[PDB]
């Protein structure tokens, strides 16, 4: 309940931080790829194709 | 080396054509940003082709 440093609580904070940062890092890596026009073009093409 | 440049020049023309298709698609889609990216891409390629 306290959230004070503990054998279980301490481990949980670090792991959660790692999960948050790793996901953010992946997103950061992803956004650069996302920024390029070709990636955007594929999504637009797919939507038209999907509707058909 | 001359053949490689010619292939690169051919690739640039091919690349422009691929970009052109996206631009045509963009107009149908109505998204201004997709069209803009193709034009910028076309210009650098043209300069490279001229230099080549």
mmCIF file with all atom_site columns, C-alpha atoms in Angstrom:
data_model
loop_
_atom_site.group_PDB
_atom_site.id
_atom_site.type_symbol
_atom_site.label_atom_id
_atom_site.label_alt_id
_atom_site.label_comp_id
_atom_site.label_asym_id
_atom_site.label_entity_id
_atom_site.label_seq_id
_atom_site.pdbx_PDB_ins_code
_atom_site.Cartn_x
_atom_site.Cartn_y
_atom_site.Cartn_z
_atom_site.occupancy
_atom_site.B_iso_or_equiv
_atom_site.pdbx_formal_charge
_atom_site.auth_seq_id
_atom_site.auth_comp_id
_atom_site.auth_asym_id
_atom_site.auth_atom_id
_atom_site.pdbx_PDB_model_num
ATOM 1   C CA . UNK A 1 1  ? 0.000   0.000  0.000   1.00 0.00 ? 1  UNK A CA 1
ATOM 2   C CA . UNK A 1 2  ? 2.750   2.459  0.954   1.00 0.00 ? 2  UNK A CA 1
ATOM 3   C CA . UNK A 1 3  ? 4.664   2.279  -2.324  1.00 0.00 ? 3  UNK A CA 1
ATOM 4   C CA . UNK A 1 4  ? 7.834   2.694  -0.280  1.00 0.00 ? 4  UNK A CA 1
ATOM 5   C CA . UNK A 1 5  ? 10.973  0.900  -1.415  1.00 0.00 ? 5  UNK A CA 1
ATOM 6   C CA . UNK A 1 6  ? 10.457  -2.827 -0.928  1.00 0.00 ? 6  UNK A CA 1
ATOM 7   C CA . UNK A 1 7  ? 11.535  -6.202 -2.284  1.00 0.00 ? 7  UNK A CA 1
ATOM 8   C CA . UNK A 1 8  ? 8.422   -6.330 -4.472  1.00 0.00 ? 8  UNK A CA 1
ATOM 9   C CA . UNK A 1 9  ? 7.596   -2.638 -4.817  1.00 0.00 ? 9  UNK A CA 1
ATOM 10  C CA . UNK A 1 10 ? 11.107  -1.640 -5.895  1.00 0.00 ? 10 UNK A CA 1
ATOM 11  C CA . UNK A 1 11 ? 11.170  -4.328 -8.577  1.00 0.00 ? 11 UNK A CA 1
ATOM 12  C CA . UNK A 1 12 ? 7.764   -3.268 -9.882  1.00 0.00 ? 12 UNK A CA 1
ATOM 13  C CA . UNK A 1 13 ? 8.696   0.389  -10.320 1.00 0.00 ? 13 UNK A CA 1
ATOM 14  C CA . UNK A 1 14 ? 11.795  -0.372 -12.390 1.00 0.00 ? 14 UNK A CA 1
ATOM 15  C CA . UNK A 1 15 ? 10.063  -2.961 -14.566 1.00 0.00 ? 15 UNK A CA 1
ATOM 16  C CA . UNK A 1 16 ? 7.156   -0.631 -15.251 1.00 0.00 ? 16 UNK A CA 1
ATOM 17  C CA . UNK A 1 17 ? 9.561   2.147  -16.145 1.00 0.00 ? 17 UNK A CA 1
ATOM 18  C CA . UNK A 1 18 ? 11.393  -0.164 -18.533 1.00 0.00 ? 18 UNK A CA 1
ATOM 19  C CA . UNK A 1 19 ? 8.140   -1.193 -20.184 1.00 0.00 ? 19 UNK A CA 1
ATOM 20  C CA . UNK A 1 20 ? 7.085   2.438  -20.623 1.00 0.00 ? 20 UNK A CA 1
ATOM 21  C CA . UNK A 1 21 ? 10.452  3.547  -22.018 1.00 0.00 ? 21 UNK A CA 1
ATOM 22  C CA . UNK A 1 22 ? 10.912  0.551  -24.306 1.00 0.00 ? 22 UNK A CA 1
ATOM 23  C CA . UNK A 1 23 ? 7.447   1.084  -25.766 1.00 0.00 ? 23 UNK A CA 1
ATOM 24  C CA . UNK A 1 24 ? 8.202   4.782  -26.176 1.00 0.00 ? 24 UNK A CA 1
ATOM 25  C CA . UNK A 1 25 ? 11.526  3.939  -27.804 1.00 0.00 ? 25 UNK A CA 1
ATOM 26  C CA . UNK A 1 26 ? 9.775   1.579  -30.210 1.00 0.00 ? 26 UNK A CA 1
ATOM 27  C CA . UNK A 1 27 ? 7.235   4.296  -30.991 1.00 0.00 ? 27 UNK A CA 1
ATOM 28  C CA . UNK A 1 28 ? 10.057  6.787  -31.513 1.00 0.00 ? 28 UNK A CA 1
ATOM 29  C CA . UNK A 1 29 ? 11.749  4.353  -33.889 1.00 0.00 ? 29 UNK A CA 1
ATOM 30  C CA . UNK A 1 30 ? 8.393   3.753  -35.566 1.00 0.00 ? 30 UNK A CA 1
ATOM 31  C CA . UNK A 1 31 ? 7.514   7.422  -36.037 1.00 0.00 ? 31 UNK A CA 1
ATOM 32  C CA . UNK A 1 32 ? 10.614  8.108  -38.163 1.00 0.00 ? 32 UNK A CA 1
ATOM 33  C CA . UNK A 1 33 ? 9.592   5.238  -40.462 1.00 0.00 ? 33 UNK A CA 1
ATOM 34  C CA . UNK A 1 34 ? 6.003   6.503  -40.302 1.00 0.00 ? 34 UNK A CA 1
ATOM 35  C CA . UNK A 1 35 ? 7.059   9.996  -41.370 1.00 0.00 ? 35 UNK A CA 1
ATOM 36  C CA . UNK A 1 36 ? 8.232   8.795  -44.799 1.00 0.00 ? 36 UNK A CA 1
ATOM 37  C CA . UNK A 1 37 ? 5.701   9.235  -47.645 1.00 0.00 ? 37 UNK A CA 1
ATOM 38  C CA . UNK A 1 38 ? 5.800   5.625  -48.853 1.00 0.00 ? 38 UNK A CA 1
ATOM 39  C CA . UNK A 1 39 ? 4.581   4.267  -45.512 1.00 0.00 ? 39 UNK A CA 1
ATOM 40  C CA . UNK A 1 40 ? 1.681   6.736  -45.550 1.00 0.00 ? 40 UNK A CA 1
ATOM 41  C CA . UNK A 1 41 ? 0.867   5.844  -49.158 1.00 0.00 ? 41 UNK A CA 1
ATOM 42  C CA . UNK A 1 42 ? 0.487   2.154  -48.336 1.00 0.00 ? 42 UNK A CA 1
ATOM 43  C CA . UNK A 1 43 ? -2.160  2.906  -45.710 1.00 0.00 ? 43 UNK A CA 1
ATOM 44  C CA . UNK A 1 44 ? -4.178  5.026  -48.143 1.00 0.00 ? 44 UNK A CA 1
ATOM 45  C CA . UNK A 1 45 ? -3.975  2.345  -50.830 1.00 0.00 ? 45 UNK A CA 1
ATOM 46  C CA . UNK A 1 46 ? -5.053  -0.324 -48.360 1.00 0.00 ? 46 UNK A CA 1
ATOM 47  C CA . UNK A 1 47 ? -8.173  1.532  -47.287 1.00 0.00 ? 47 UNK A CA 1
ATOM 48  C CA . UNK A 1 48 ? -9.388  1.924  -50.859 1.00 0.00 ? 48 UNK A CA 1
ATOM 49  C CA . UNK A 1 49 ? -8.609  -1.733 -51.529 1.00 0.00 ? 49 UNK A CA 1
ATOM 50  C CA . UNK A 1 50 ? -10.346 -2.825 -48.329 1.00 0.00 ? 50 UNK A CA 1
ATOM 51  C CA . UNK A 1 51 ? -13.536 -0.975 -49.240 1.00 0.00 ? 51 UNK A CA 1
ATOM 52  C CA . UNK A 1 52 ? -13.556 -2.626 -52.661 1.00 0.00 ? 52 UNK A CA 1
ATOM 53  C CA . UNK B 2 1  ? 30.664  2.804  -63.405 1.00 0.00 ? 1  UNK B CA 1
ATOM 54  C CA . UNK B 2 2  ? 28.844  4.310  -66.393 1.00 0.00 ? 2  UNK B CA 1
ATOM 55  C CA . UNK B 2 3  ? 26.401  1.401  -66.403 1.00 0.00 ? 3  UNK B CA 1
ATOM 56  C CA . UNK B 2 4  ? 25.774  1.851  -62.681 1.00 0.00 ? 4  UNK B CA 1
ATOM 57  C CA . UNK B 2 5  ? 24.990  5.546  -63.150 1.00 0.00 ? 5  UNK B CA 1
ATOM 58  C CA . UNK B 2 6  ? 22.677  4.672  -66.039 1.00 0.00 ? 6  UNK B CA 1
ATOM 59  C CA . UNK B 2 7  ? 20.928  2.104  -63.846 1.00 0.00 ? 7  UNK B CA 1
ATOM 60  C CA . UNK B 2 8  ? 20.675  4.712  -61.089 1.00 0.00 ? 8  UNK B CA 1
ATOM 61  C CA . UNK B 2 9  ? 19.318  7.211  -63.612 1.00 0.00 ? 9  UNK B CA 1
ATOM 62  C CA . UNK B 2 10 ? 16.815  4.601  -64.787 1.00 0.00 ? 10 UNK B CA 1
ATOM 63  C CA . UNK B 2 11 ? 15.935  3.850  -61.167 1.00 0.00 ? 11 UNK B CA 1
ATOM 64  C CA . UNK B 2 12 ? 15.363  7.547  -60.500 1.00 0.00 ? 12 UNK B CA 1
ATOM 65  C CA . UNK B 2 13 ? 12.951  7.716  -63.436 1.00 0.00 ? 13 UNK B CA 1
ATOM 66  C CA . UNK B 2 14 ? 11.240  4.582  -62.138 1.00 0.00 ? 14 UNK B CA 1
ATOM 67  C CA . UNK B 2 15 ? 11.173  6.063  -58.640 1.00 0.00 ? 15 UNK B CA 1
ATOM 68  C CA . UNK B 2 16 ? 9.551   9.229  -59.979 1.00 0.00 ? 16 UNK B CA 1
ATOM 69  C CA . UNK B 2 17 ? 6.904   7.147  -61.743 1.00 0.00 ? 17 UNK B CA 1
ATOM 70  C CA . UNK B 2 18 ? 6.101   5.275  -58.529 1.00 0.00 ? 18 UNK B CA 1
ATOM 71  C CA . UNK B 2 19 ? 5.847   8.607  -56.709 1.00 0.00 ? 19 UNK B CA 1
ATOM 72  C CA . UNK B 2 20 ? 3.679   9.972  -59.528 1.00 0.00 ? 20 UNK B CA 1
ATOM 73  C CA . UNK B 2 21 ? 1.164   7.148  -59.035 1.00 0.00 ? 21 UNK B CA 1
ATOM 74  C CA . UNK B 2 22 ? 0.912   8.059  -55.348 1.00 0.00 ? 22 UNK B CA 1
ATOM 75  C CA . UNK B 2 23 ? 0.387   11.710 -56.283 1.00 0.00 ? 23 UNK B CA 1
ATOM 76  C CA . UNK B 2 24 ? -2.454  10.694 -58.608 1.00 0.00 ? 24 UNK B CA 1
ATOM 77  C CA . UNK B 2 25 ? -3.870  8.543  -55.808 1.00 0.00 ? 25 UNK B CA 1
ATOM 78  C CA . UNK B 2 26 ? -3.459  11.439 -53.382 1.00 0.00 ? 26 UNK B CA 1
ATOM 79  C CA . UNK B 2 27 ? -5.590  13.704 -55.569 1.00 0.00 ? 27 UNK B CA 1
ATOM 80  C CA . UNK B 2 28 ? -8.373  11.110 -55.582 1.00 0.00 ? 28 UNK B CA 1
ATOM 81  C CA . UNK B 2 29 ? -7.913  10.687 -51.829 1.00 0.00 ? 29 UNK B CA 1
ATOM 82  C CA . UNK B 2 30 ? -7.930  14.456 -51.372 1.00 0.00 ? 30 UNK B CA 1
ATOM 83  C CA . UNK B 2 31 ? -5.010  14.510 -48.942 1.00 0.00 ? 31 UNK B CA 1
ATOM 84  C CA . UNK B 2 32 ? -2.750  17.544 -49.617 1.00 0.00 ? 32 UNK B CA 1
ATOM 85  C CA . UNK B 2 33 ? 0.249   16.218 -47.669 1.00 0.00 ? 33 UNK B CA 1
ATOM 86  C CA . UNK B 2 34 ? 0.753   13.060 -49.735 1.00 0.00 ? 34 UNK B CA 1
ATOM 87  C CA . UNK B 2 35 ? 0.799   15.096 -52.951 1.00 0.00 ? 35 UNK B CA 1
ATOM 88  C CA . UNK B 2 36 ? 3.303   17.579 -51.509 1.00 0.00 ? 36 UNK B CA 1
ATOM 89  C CA . UNK B 2 37 ? 5.821   14.886 -50.571 1.00 0.00 ? 37 UNK B CA 1
ATOM 90  C CA . UNK B 2 38 ? 5.889   13.503 -54.112 1.00 0.00 ? 38 UNK B CA 1
ATOM 91  C CA . UNK B 2 39 ? 6.628   16.914 -55.629 1.00 0.00 ? 39 UNK B CA 1
ATOM 92  C CA . UNK B 2 40 ? 9.574   17.520 -53.299 1.00 0.00 ? 40 UNK B CA 1
ATOM 93  C CA . UNK B 2 41 ? 10.856  14.016 -54.022 1.00 0.00 ? 41 UNK B CA 1
ATOM 94  C CA . UNK B 2 42 ? 10.496  14.595 -57.753 1.00 0.00 ? 42 UNK B CA 1
ATOM 95  C CA . UNK B 2 43 ? 12.598  17.775 -57.620 1.00 0.00 ? 43 UNK B CA 1
ATOM 96  C CA . UNK B 2 44 ? 15.650  16.282 -55.877 1.00 0.00 ? 44 UNK B CA 1
ATOM 97  C CA . UNK B 2 45 ? 15.582  13.272 -58.199 1.00 0.00 ? 45 UNK B CA 1
ATOM 98  C CA . UNK B 2 46 ? 15.438  15.549 -61.235 1.00 0.00 ? 46 UNK B CA 1
ATOM 99  C CA . UNK B 2 47 ? 18.439  17.504 -59.975 1.00 0.00 ? 47 UNK B CA 1
ATOM 100 C CA . UNK B 2 48 ? 20.308  14.256 -59.371 1.00 0.00 ? 48 UNK B CA 1
ATOM 101 C CA . UNK B 2 49 ? 19.364  13.031 -62.838 1.00 0.00 ? 49 UNK B CA 1
ATOM 102 C CA . UNK B 2 50 ? 20.528  16.285 -64.409 1.00 0.00 ? 50 UNK B CA 1
ATOM 103 C CA . UNK B 2 51 ? 23.802  16.098 -62.497 1.00 0.00 ? 51 UNK B CA 1
ATOM 104 C CA . UNK B 2 52 ? 24.195  12.455 -63.482 1.00 0.00 ? 52 UNK B CA 1
#
